Structures are given as C-alpha cells and as structure tokens.
C-alpha cells in the first residue's frame, strides 16, 4: 500500500484550509494596545532543604502550601506564607520527574523514571504520610502528572502515550495514544474536560479525556516540546520548545497564533505558565534566568534574574499572587 | 501558630540527618521496574549504581537526569549493526552535551571492514601487553580506545575527565581521582 | 512542521555513482547539524555521515570513508550525498536525518527507530 501520497494530499488540504481562515496575525491585531511596561520582581522567598536539583514544584487550590520534588528522593510541602516545611515525605526512587498536588489537597502524586505513579495520603490518621497507590501501567519514565479529582489522575509517559487512571482501583480507565516522541509535558483544561500534551515530536496534540481520541494536532515547532500550559480561557495554549521559542496555539483556529523568540536567546525552554489574566507569559530557559513576555504583543516585559542553574520548574499560584520558580541550584525563589 | 514551628524544627532535623547519608552515597549511571538501582560498598564508601532498563532507544531527555552522578559507567559492545561506531557516536553526543560537560565518563571496553584505518594502523609500542595475548586483540583495543581518545581530547571546555580501561576498584579509584580533581578546581588550583 | 524530504537514487551497476539530495523546509536550516543515515535489509539502522552547521567539520563511518562526500547548501537548504565507487554492501534505504536541538554540537537519538526529524528514505539498490 502506497496512501503516502493520499497522506500529503490530506495534510495539504489541512494547511490550506488554515491559510483561508487566516484573516491576519495577532500582532496587527494587537498593535495599538499599550504596552504593560517594565516588570520587576523581587525574590520575595527563598525555601532552601533540598539537597539536590528540583524537577518540579506545585501549588495547591489555597495559594499558601506548595509541593517541590528533588532528586535527593525527597518530596517537600512548604507554607510559602512562613517559609515553614509542612511535609518532607520520603520517596522510595529518588529520580522524581514530576510532583503534583491534589485540588482538594488530601493527596500528592509523584513519579519519574521508574514508571510508576505514587499516591501519597497526606490527611491520615496515624500523623505520618504513607504510599497511598502505586499506579503501575507506563512504560517510560513519567514526564507529568495532573489531578482531576481525588479520584482520577492524568499521565504522560516517555512511552509516547498519556493515561487516565482510576486511584481508587488503580487501572488505566483510558489510554492516550498517537504521539511519536516523549510526551514531555501535559496541562489540563480549566474545565477539566480536555488536555493538551506536547511530546518531543515538536507537536501537540489536544485530547478529550472522557473518550480516548485526539481532537487536534498543532505543528511549528522545530524541536522538542518542554512545556505547554491552557491560557487561563480554557481556549488557547502555549509551547516552549528546545529552539528558543514559545508559540502561542489557539484551540478554534487551530493554527499558531504567536510566536516569542528574540536573536539574543538562543536557549531552550524548560517551563511555561501564564499568569491570572493572561496579559503575561513566563518562561523558564536554560540560561538560568525567566523571562516575561508580553503575551499580546509579543515584546519581553521583564526578566526574572536569580537564579544560578538552569530553571527547572515554573508555577502561578491560583490567584496569581505569586510566581514560584525551581532550579537545578536546588532552591525554590517565590516572586511578587 | 507555633506548633508549625516545632513541626517545622523536626522536618529539619531529619533533612539534616538526611544530608549526611545522600552526600556520603556516590551516584552511578551505567550505560550497556523503570530503573534498576544497586547498593555496594567499597573501603566503607557506599556506591549507588543505577542501570535504567525499560526504557526507550531515545535518551535526550532522560539522560539530563544523570548530570548530578558522580561518573557515568559506559560499557561498549564490540566482543552485526556496527555497534563500535553507534556506541562511538553516543560517547560522542555524551561528552559534547552541554548538561553533561561537568560528568566524568568512565569507559570500559568489554573490524577493519568498518574501520579500514585498522588495516594500516602499528601498535604504538608504549603500550603495556599482558602476556600470552594475540598481537591482533591488544591492537584492536588499543585502537578502539585511540578511535574514543580522538573524541575525548577533541574537547575546548567542560570539567569532564575520561577514565578508559583496556572491576569495582577501578571505578572506586577513578571516582576517587574525579572527587579529588572536583575539589582542585574548587580551590581553582586545576 | 518538519518535512525532510529526500530523492535520488536507484539501481546502479556496482562501481557506479549516484546523489542523493535532500530539501528539508519547516525550519532553518543553518542552524541544525544535518546527518545521513541507512538501514540495510534486515539490519538495524546505522550512521553514514554528517555535516555541522557552517560545513567545516565533516564525518563519515569508516565504511564510506574517501568514496563518500556530504555538502550542505543553506542557501537553497538542501543536502547532498555524492556517492562513488559504489559497493554490493550499499544498497539501503537511505535516511536525511536531522538532529534534534540547534546550536549543538551533540546529535542524541539519530539513528534510533521512531525518531522524528527524520525523512522517508531513499532506496539506493546495486
């Protein structure tokens, strides 16, 4: 069979009816508005007890308590608020990738290149967190994990595939397939009912999580994909990849829509999110340094300069209160 | 109020007490559940080595996990596909990647058709031949590791250090001479 | 979107000569090291050649050393093998491979199976 040709037709048809839909680009659209001007923050914290480089970090529904992963094997919560360590939970592998906290924020979930999942219960009863589950159906290292609820967890695995469990029981419920590289990243929508996932293919790739297939695919990329994060609508996303470059994606156009890239960064993207209102899109690279771009007009608006590693990880509290970067440097710096 | 206090005060304590085993344990990657780990210990230092199996072919993303570790064990397989070259190549990719340009390679080794520089290459005769050996095998070892010194001399910056050989205490003392040469170059003495 | 589209190449007597291009578009071109790769019938896949970004550094596997030529033309972003001289031990699908980050010296994961950046192949039969 030789549809190859059929494939590229069909691929092409696709480009074209993007162009048609293509009226114009954001920027002459978005090029009379005023500019947000210098942003400046200030290290307002800086937790310190890792003894290795953080992977990753994650805030909770109430904006005070945060959960950062290290590679000393050691799962921490901090009361951002006091700088005071709420939980030091101890892994059993060390090489957690990435570490998130549950939205009712009973449970925390942490894997990485060991495939598997581990639900800790941190509301027990005997005062001393213990392995909850032990979700085990990957094949490749755990890149990201997300809750739904207390009861449900996304996953993407270096497997090239995402997954759907059911704590309770511990099974895949639903199996994401169709990605052809490491899915590095993934982020829920605010409905819940959808979400993104952006794999070393230099695609993403935007899935329903109550079925099992793919809505949409969005390509322009020209490496890997890092991080990807929803505009705080529910409508749009952004991709970092390893060309020094973030793309704003819009789910209804189904074309990129922005492109942040300056001649003077020529590092990858490790870490993406947006801010409350989405006027702000903060980007963690390899430089050791963010940056905050304007995410309408495309022009830097700041640099968040303080750290001494690469930026591992990035997070915005919920009501856009705080920004908390992660490093390799092994220090968590909250940013206001 | 306060009790987050003490809380806080014991969560410390046992960081601290934490401290003391991780920089006491030397991590050890080596390359041939989702990660096989291995405790040993020699002269009463705990090495901690990890063999990471059921992965995929494709390391870019993984292998920044091991950047930390204090040298990374690399096993060649040539005594097919041309396994020598591939396994050249991702020495290659190892020692030139900007996340593992500070991590120590250490390079055990356990034909002219794909390299037929072979054919009029002389054994250089410092070499150190152990008896009742075919002139054959030791000049095919010493150009295999002539063909991966070629790649790790070609260097311009990086703390990286290669440590070939031709077996705990070779990889116990070349951990020794990278701890010894990492302190140097904090005293900016190297 | 990455397309890496590569042609030439048939069936030639042996000793023949052949040259296999290469248009890559999605992306620029200058700033990726550029890689030929080919996996023999019923063989894994495996390293031919490379060329960095500029074109001075240049390198083949022993096999190919000397009859082989890689050349990279950015202006038109196109990638060529000049192949001479050539042996019953060359026929194969013959991949333009790419490598993953620009700006590196390093080249990860070419010659991997299901790894992106990578063209259909050319049949090359002698």
């Known amino acids: 069979d030789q549809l190859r040709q059929e494939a590229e037709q069909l691929k092409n048809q696709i480009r074209d009816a993007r162009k048609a839909c293509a009226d114009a680009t954001l920027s002459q659209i978005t090029n009379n508005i005023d500019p947000v001007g210098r942003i400046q923050m200030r290290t307002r914290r800086t937790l310190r007890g890792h003894l290795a480089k953080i992977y990753a970090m994650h805030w909770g529904t109430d904006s005070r308590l945060l959960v950062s992963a290290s590679q000393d094997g050691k799962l921490i919560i901090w009361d951002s608020y006091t700088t005071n360590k709420v939980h030091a939970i101890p892994l059993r592998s060390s090489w957690v990738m990435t570490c998130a906290y549950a939205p009712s924020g009973n449970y925390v979930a942490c894997g990485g290149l060991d495939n598997i999942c581990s639900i800790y219960n941190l509301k027990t009863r005997e005062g001393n967190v213990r392995v909850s589950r032990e979700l085990a159906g990957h094949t490749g290292y755990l890149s990201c994990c997300r809750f739904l609820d207390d009861n449900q967890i996304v996953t993407s695995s270096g497997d090239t595939t995402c997954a759907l469990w059911d704590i309770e029981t511990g099974q895949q419920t639903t199996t994401f397939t169709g990605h052809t590289g490491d899915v590095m990243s993934l982020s829920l929508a605010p409905d819940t009912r959808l979400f993104v996932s952006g794999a070393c293919d230099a695609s993403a790739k935007l899935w329903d999580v109550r079925e099992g297939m793919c809505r949409q695919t969005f390509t322009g990329h020209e490496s890997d994909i890092n991080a990807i994060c929803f505009f705080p609508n529910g409508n749009a996303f952004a991709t970092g990849s390893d060309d020094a470059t973030c793309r704003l994606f819009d789910l209804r156009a189904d074309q990129e829509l922005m492109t942040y890239s300056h001649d003077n960064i020529i590092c990858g993207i490790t870490s993406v999110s947006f801010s409350k209102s989405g006027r702000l899109l903060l980007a963690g690279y390899d430089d050791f340094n963010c940056n905050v771009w304007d995410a309408l007009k495309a022009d830097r608006a700041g640099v968040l300069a303080g750290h001494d590693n690469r930026v591992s990880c990035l997070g915005v509290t919920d009501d856009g209160m705080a920004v908390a970067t992660g490093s390799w440097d092994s220090f968590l710096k909250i940013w206001n | 109020e306060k009790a987050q206090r003490e809380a806080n005060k014991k969560i410390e304590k046992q960081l601290q007490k934490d401290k003391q085993v991780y920089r006491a344990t030397h991590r050890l990657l080596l390359l041939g559940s989702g990660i096989f780990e291995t405790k040993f210990q020699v002269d009463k230092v705990n090495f901690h080595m990890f063999d990471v199996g059921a992965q995929r072919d494709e390391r870019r993303k993984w292998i920044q996990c091991f950047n930390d570790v204090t040298a990374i064990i690399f096993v060649v397989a040539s005594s097919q596909t041309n396994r020598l070259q591939a396994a050249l190549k991702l020495f290659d990719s190892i020692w030139n990647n900007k996340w593992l340009r500070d991590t120590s390679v250490i390079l055990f080794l356990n034909i002219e058709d794909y390299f037929p520089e072979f054919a009029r290459y002389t054994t250089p005769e410092d070499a150190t031949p152990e008896p009742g050996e075919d002139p054959r095998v030791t000049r095919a070892k010493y150009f295999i590791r002539d063909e991966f010194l070629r790649i790790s001399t070609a260097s311009g910056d990086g703390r990286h250090y290669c440590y070939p050989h031709f077996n705990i205490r070779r990889v116990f003392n070349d951990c020794r001479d990278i701890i010894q040469r990492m302190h140097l170059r904090q005293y900016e003495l190297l | 979107q990455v397309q890496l589209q590569e042609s030439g190449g048939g069936l030639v007597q042996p000793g023949g000569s052949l040259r296999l291009s290469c248009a890559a578009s999605?992306?620029?071109?200058?700033?990726?090291?550029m890689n030929w790769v080919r996996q023999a019938p019923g063989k894994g896949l495996e390293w031919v050649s490379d060329?960095?970004?500029?074109?001075?550094?240049?390198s083949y596997t022993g096999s190919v050393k000397g009859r082989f030529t890689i050349s990279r033309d950015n202006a038109k972003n196109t990638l060529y093998l000049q192949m001479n001289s050539l042996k019953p031990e060359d026929t194969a699908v013959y991949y333009c491979?790419?490598?993953?980050?620009?700006?590196?010296?390093?080249?990860?994961?070419?010659?991997?199976?299901?790894?992106?950046?990578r063209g259909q192949g050319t049949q090359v039969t002698v």
């Open positions: 060329i960095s970004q500029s074109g001075a550094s240049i």
């Open positions: 491979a790419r490598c993953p980050a620009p700006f590196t010296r390093d080249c990860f994961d070419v010659t991997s199976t299901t790894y992106a950046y």
């Open positions: 999605g992306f620029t071109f200058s700033n990726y090291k």
